[PDB]
Amino acid sequence: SWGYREHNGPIHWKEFFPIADGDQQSPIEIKTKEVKYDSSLRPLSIKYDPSSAKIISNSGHSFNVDFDDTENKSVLRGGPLTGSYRLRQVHLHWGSADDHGSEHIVDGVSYAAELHVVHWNSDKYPSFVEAAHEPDGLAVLGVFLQIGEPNSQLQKITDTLDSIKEKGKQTRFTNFDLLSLLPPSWDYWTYPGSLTVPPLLESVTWIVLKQPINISSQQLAKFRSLLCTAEGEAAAFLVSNHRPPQPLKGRKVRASFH
Ligand SMILES: COC(=O)c1ccc(SCc2ccccc2)c(S(N)(=O)=O)c1
Ligand SMILES: [Zn+2]
Protein backbone atom coordinates (compact mmCIF):
# COMPACT_ATOMS: atom_id res chain seq x y z
CA SER A 1 0.00 0.00 0.00
CA TRP A 2 1.09 3.50 -0.91
CA GLY A 3 3.33 5.93 0.95
CA TYR A 4 6.54 7.89 0.60
CA ARG A 5 9.11 5.15 1.30
CA GLU A 6 11.47 3.75 -1.30
CA HIS A 7 9.26 0.91 -2.55
CA ASN A 8 5.83 2.53 -2.19
CA GLY A 9 6.69 6.15 -2.91
CA PRO A 10 5.54 8.67 -5.59
CA ILE A 11 7.72 7.29 -8.37
CA HIS A 12 5.82 3.95 -8.02
CA TRP A 13 2.32 5.36 -7.86
CA LYS A 14 2.00 5.23 -11.69
CA GLU A 15 2.39 1.42 -11.40
CA PHE A 16 -0.93 1.24 -9.49
CA PHE A 17 -3.04 4.34 -10.23
CA PRO A 18 -3.69 4.91 -13.96
CA ILE A 19 -4.44 8.60 -13.41
CA ALA A 20 -0.95 9.24 -11.93
CA ASP A 21 0.27 9.77 -15.54
CA GLY A 22 -2.80 11.85 -16.51
CA ASP A 23 -2.87 15.27 -18.10
CA GLN A 24 -4.04 17.35 -15.10
CA GLN A 25 -1.76 16.16 -12.29
CA SER A 26 -0.47 18.18 -9.30
CA PRO A 27 1.68 19.71 -7.93
CA ILE A 28 3.53 21.80 -10.54
CA GLU A 29 6.35 24.31 -10.96
CA ILE A 30 5.06 27.87 -10.97
CA LYS A 31 7.17 30.16 -13.18
CA THR A 32 6.03 33.60 -12.07
CA LYS A 33 7.02 35.46 -15.20
CA GLU A 34 5.15 32.92 -17.40
CA VAL A 35 1.83 33.07 -15.53
CA LYS A 36 -1.01 35.06 -17.11
CA TYR A 37 -2.70 37.88 -15.09
CA ASP A 38 -6.50 37.38 -15.61
CA SER A 39 -8.87 40.29 -14.85
CA SER A 40 -11.82 37.86 -14.96
CA LEU A 41 -10.61 36.32 -11.70
CA ARG A 42 -12.31 37.56 -8.56
CA PRO A 43 -10.90 38.21 -5.06
CA LEU A 44 -10.97 35.32 -2.59
CA SER A 45 -13.73 35.61 0.04
CA ILE A 46 -13.09 33.40 3.08
CA LYS A 47 -15.23 32.68 6.17
CA TYR A 48 -13.82 30.08 8.56
CA ASP A 49 -15.69 29.54 11.84
CA PRO A 50 -13.35 28.60 14.76
CA SER A 51 -16.04 26.24 15.99
CA SER A 52 -15.86 24.15 12.77
CA ALA A 53 -12.69 22.20 13.68
CA LYS A 54 -13.48 19.07 15.66
CA ILE A 55 -10.88 16.22 15.46
CA ILE A 56 -7.20 15.82 14.56
CA SER A 57 -5.86 12.44 13.49
CA ASN A 58 -2.78 10.75 12.05
CA SER A 59 -3.76 9.29 8.65
CA GLY A 60 -0.34 7.69 8.23
CA HIS A 61 0.45 10.26 5.51
CA SER A 62 0.04 13.58 7.42
CA PHE A 63 -2.02 14.87 10.27
CA ASN A 64 -5.62 15.71 9.27
CA VAL A 65 -7.79 18.29 11.03
CA ASP A 66 -11.41 17.41 10.23
CA PHE A 67 -14.11 20.11 10.17
CA ASP A 68 -17.87 19.77 10.57
CA ASP A 69 -19.09 20.17 7.00
CA THR A 70 -22.73 19.54 7.96
CA GLU A 71 -23.62 23.02 6.66
CA ASN A 72 -22.06 26.28 5.41
CA LYS A 73 -20.51 27.70 8.55
CA SER A 74 -17.02 27.60 6.94
CA VAL A 75 -16.72 28.34 3.22
CA LEU A 76 -14.47 29.60 0.48
CA ARG A 77 -15.97 31.73 -2.30
CA GLY A 78 -14.63 33.95 -5.10
CA GLY A 79 -11.26 33.52 -6.75
CA PRO A 80 -11.69 31.31 -9.86
CA LEU A 81 -14.65 29.46 -8.28
CA THR A 82 -18.33 29.45 -9.19
CA GLY A 83 -20.49 29.31 -6.02
CA SER A 84 -19.53 28.27 -2.53
CA TYR A 85 -17.07 25.54 -1.48
CA ARG A 86 -17.37 24.07 2.04
CA LEU A 87 -14.33 23.53 4.32
CA ARG A 88 -13.61 19.81 4.94
CA GLN A 89 -10.03 19.18 6.08
CA VAL A 90 -6.54 20.68 6.62
CA HIS A 91 -3.19 18.85 6.37
CA LEU A 92 0.50 19.63 5.81
CA HIS A 93 3.32 18.46 3.55
CA TRP A 94 7.04 18.62 4.37
CA GLY A 95 10.38 17.04 3.40
CA SER A 96 13.27 15.57 5.35
CA ALA A 97 15.15 18.86 4.92
CA ASP A 98 13.89 22.40 5.64
CA ASP A 99 14.92 23.73 2.23
CA HIS A 100 12.99 21.19 0.16
CA GLY A 101 9.58 20.49 1.71
CA SER A 102 6.81 22.04 -0.38
CA GLU A 103 4.79 20.45 -3.23
CA HIS A 104 4.40 23.50 -5.46
CA ILE A 105 7.72 25.12 -6.34
CA VAL A 106 7.92 28.86 -7.19
CA ASP A 107 10.70 29.98 -9.55
CA GLY A 108 12.71 26.99 -8.34
CA VAL A 109 12.11 27.75 -4.65
CA SER A 110 10.83 24.88 -2.57
CA TYR A 111 9.53 26.14 0.79
CA ALA A 112 9.94 24.34 4.10
CA ALA A 113 6.35 23.02 4.11
CA GLU A 114 2.98 23.57 2.44
CA LEU A 115 -0.44 23.63 4.15
CA HIS A 116 -3.43 22.46 2.13
CA VAL A 117 -7.00 23.55 2.98
CA VAL A 118 -9.49 21.22 1.24
CA HIS A 119 -13.02 22.30 0.26
CA TRP A 120 -15.85 20.78 -1.79
CA ASN A 121 -18.54 22.28 -4.03
CA SER A 122 -21.73 21.89 -1.95
CA ASP A 123 -23.67 24.14 -4.35
CA LYS A 124 -23.49 21.36 -7.00
CA TYR A 125 -22.69 18.05 -5.21
CA PRO A 126 -24.31 16.43 -2.14
CA SER A 127 -21.13 15.28 -0.42
CA PHE A 128 -17.32 15.47 -0.45
CA VAL A 129 -17.10 11.95 -1.86
CA GLU A 130 -19.31 12.72 -4.85
CA ALA A 131 -17.56 16.07 -5.48
CA ALA A 132 -14.14 14.41 -5.40
CA HIS A 133 -15.07 12.71 -8.72
CA GLU A 134 -16.02 15.79 -10.76
CA PRO A 135 -13.73 18.38 -12.48
CA ASP A 136 -15.24 21.24 -10.51
CA GLY A 137 -15.81 19.30 -7.28
CA LEU A 138 -12.89 20.42 -5.09
CA ALA A 139 -10.92 23.56 -4.28
CA VAL A 140 -7.65 23.41 -2.36
CA LEU A 141 -5.97 26.51 -0.92
CA GLY A 142 -2.20 26.11 -0.65
CA VAL A 143 -0.14 28.11 1.84
CA PHE A 144 3.67 28.00 1.87
CA LEU A 145 5.62 27.88 5.14
CA GLN A 146 9.12 29.32 5.38
CA ILE A 147 11.56 28.85 8.24
CA GLY A 148 11.55 31.85 10.55
CA GLU A 149 10.07 32.99 13.86
CA PRO A 150 7.93 30.28 15.57
CA ASN A 151 4.30 30.56 14.51
CA SER A 152 2.05 30.77 17.54
CA GLN A 153 -0.90 29.77 15.34
CA LEU A 154 0.72 26.31 14.83
CA GLN A 155 1.16 25.69 18.58
CA LYS A 156 -2.29 24.18 19.06
CA ILE A 157 -1.39 21.59 16.40
CA THR A 158 2.13 20.76 17.61
CA ASP A 159 0.82 20.28 21.17
CA THR A 160 -1.41 17.41 19.96
CA LEU A 161 1.15 15.46 18.01
CA ASP A 162 2.34 13.35 20.93
CA SER A 163 -1.21 11.99 21.34
CA ILE A 164 -1.51 10.99 17.68
CA LYS A 165 1.94 9.49 17.11
CA GLU A 166 0.71 6.19 15.59
CA LYS A 167 -1.30 5.84 12.36
CA GLY A 168 -5.05 5.90 13.10
CA LYS A 169 -4.92 7.74 16.44
CA GLN A 170 -7.29 10.67 16.85
CA THR A 171 -7.97 13.32 19.47
CA ARG A 172 -10.44 16.17 20.04
CA PHE A 173 -9.41 19.38 18.35
CA THR A 174 -11.71 22.39 18.53
CA ASN A 175 -11.79 26.19 18.75
CA PHE A 176 -9.15 26.48 16.00
CA ASP A 177 -8.80 29.88 14.34
CA LEU A 178 -7.74 28.79 10.86
CA LEU A 179 -8.38 32.27 9.51
CA SER A 180 -5.52 33.59 11.67
CA LEU A 181 -3.06 31.11 10.18
CA LEU A 182 -3.45 32.57 6.64
CA PRO A 183 -1.04 35.29 5.42
CA PRO A 184 -2.16 38.97 5.26
CA SER A 185 -2.29 39.11 1.42
CA TRP A 186 -4.69 36.78 -0.39
CA ASP A 187 -3.04 37.24 -3.86
CA TYR A 188 -2.92 33.86 -5.59
CA TRP A 189 -2.14 31.71 -8.61
CA THR A 190 -4.65 29.14 -9.91
CA TYR A 191 -4.74 26.16 -12.28
CA PRO A 192 -6.79 22.94 -12.75
CA GLY A 193 -5.15 19.93 -11.18
CA SER A 194 -5.45 16.89 -8.97
CA LEU A 195 -5.20 15.47 -5.49
CA THR A 196 -1.51 15.04 -4.69
CA VAL A 197 -2.05 11.70 -2.97
CA PRO A 198 -3.83 8.52 -4.21
CA PRO A 199 -6.41 8.38 -5.63
CA LEU A 200 -4.91 11.39 -7.51
CA LEU A 201 -8.37 12.44 -8.81
CA GLU A 202 -8.38 15.34 -11.36
CA SER A 203 -11.10 17.26 -9.49
CA VAL A 204 -9.13 20.15 -7.93
CA THR A 205 -9.14 23.85 -8.61
CA TRP A 206 -5.80 24.85 -7.04
CA ILE A 207 -5.50 28.29 -5.41
CA VAL A 208 -1.90 28.79 -4.26
CA LEU A 209 -1.26 31.91 -2.20
CA LYS A 210 1.84 33.90 -3.08
CA GLN A 211 2.71 35.12 0.45
CA PRO A 212 4.31 32.44 2.73
CA ILE A 213 3.73 32.21 6.56
CA ASN A 214 6.44 31.42 9.10
CA ILE A 215 7.35 28.24 11.02
CA SER A 216 10.36 27.44 13.21
CA SER A 217 12.73 24.55 12.44
CA GLN A 218 11.81 23.07 15.84
CA GLN A 219 8.07 23.21 15.08
CA LEU A 220 8.56 21.57 11.69
CA ALA A 221 10.85 18.85 13.11
CA LYS A 222 7.96 17.75 15.43
CA PHE A 223 5.86 16.70 12.40
CA ARG A 224 8.58 14.24 11.30
CA SER A 225 8.08 12.37 14.58
CA LEU A 226 4.65 11.15 13.45
CA LEU A 227 4.65 7.49 12.37
CA CYS A 228 3.41 6.07 9.07
CA THR A 229 2.74 2.79 10.95
CA ALA A 230 -0.02 1.64 13.33
CA GLU A 231 0.28 0.66 17.03
CA GLY A 232 2.06 -2.70 17.33
CA GLU A 233 3.67 -2.54 13.86
CA ALA A 234 7.42 -1.99 13.39
CA ALA A 235 7.75 1.81 13.61
CA ALA A 236 8.68 3.97 10.64
CA PHE A 237 8.72 7.74 10.73
CA LEU A 238 6.95 10.17 8.37
CA VAL A 239 10.09 12.20 7.60
CA SER A 240 8.83 13.35 4.19
CA ASN A 241 5.40 13.35 2.51
CA HIS A 242 5.58 15.56 -0.62
CA ARG A 243 4.98 14.52 -4.21
CA PRO A 244 7.43 15.75 -6.93
CA PRO A 245 6.19 18.30 -9.55
CA GLN A 246 4.22 16.94 -12.54
CA PRO A 247 4.17 18.01 -16.25
CA LEU A 248 2.04 21.09 -17.10
CA LYS A 249 0.62 19.43 -20.25
CA GLY A 250 -0.66 22.69 -21.76
CA ARG A 251 -2.63 23.89 -18.70
CA LYS A 252 -2.92 27.64 -18.13
CA VAL A 253 -1.67 28.95 -14.77
CA ARG A 254 -3.33 32.30 -14.01
CA ALA A 255 -2.43 35.07 -11.58
CA SER A 256 -4.87 37.22 -9.58
CA PHE A 257 -2.35 40.10 -9.57
CA HIS A 258 0.34 41.82 -11.61
C1 LIG B 1 0.29 13.49 2.52
O1 LIG B 1 -0.86 14.31 2.14
C2 LIG B 1 -2.11 13.88 2.47
O2 LIG B 1 -2.29 13.00 3.27
C3 LIG B 1 -3.31 14.31 1.86
C4 LIG B 1 -4.55 13.83 2.42
C5 LIG B 1 -5.75 14.19 1.81
C6 LIG B 1 -5.70 15.09 0.69
S1 LIG B 1 -7.18 15.69 -0.08
C7 LIG B 1 -8.45 14.77 0.88
C8 LIG B 1 -8.72 13.32 0.50
C9 LIG B 1 -7.96 12.62 -0.47
C10 LIG B 1 -8.24 11.27 -0.78
C11 LIG B 1 -9.28 10.61 -0.12
C12 LIG B 1 -10.04 11.30 0.86
C13 LIG B 1 -9.76 12.65 1.17
C14 LIG B 1 -4.46 15.57 0.13
S2 LIG B 1 -4.23 16.74 -1.25
N1 LIG B 1 -2.43 16.88 -1.15
O3 LIG B 1 -4.48 16.16 -2.55
O4 LIG B 1 -4.72 18.14 -1.00
C15 LIG B 1 -3.25 15.16 0.76
ZN1 LIG C 1 -2.12 18.03 0.26
Author numbering: 6 to 263
Recite the paper's sentences.
Figure shows the interactions between CAII with compounds 4c and 4d, CAIX with 4d, and CAXIII with compounds 4c and 4d. Meanwhile, a hydrogen bond is formed in the active site of CAIX and CAXIII through a water molecule with Gln70 and Asn65 or Ser64 and Asn69, respectively. Asn62 in CAII, Asn65 in CAIX, and Asn69 in CAXIII differ only by the numbering but correspond to the same position. Similarly to CAIX, the docking protocol picked the docked pose with the approximately correct binding mode (with RMSDs equal to 1.90 and 0.95 Å, respectively).
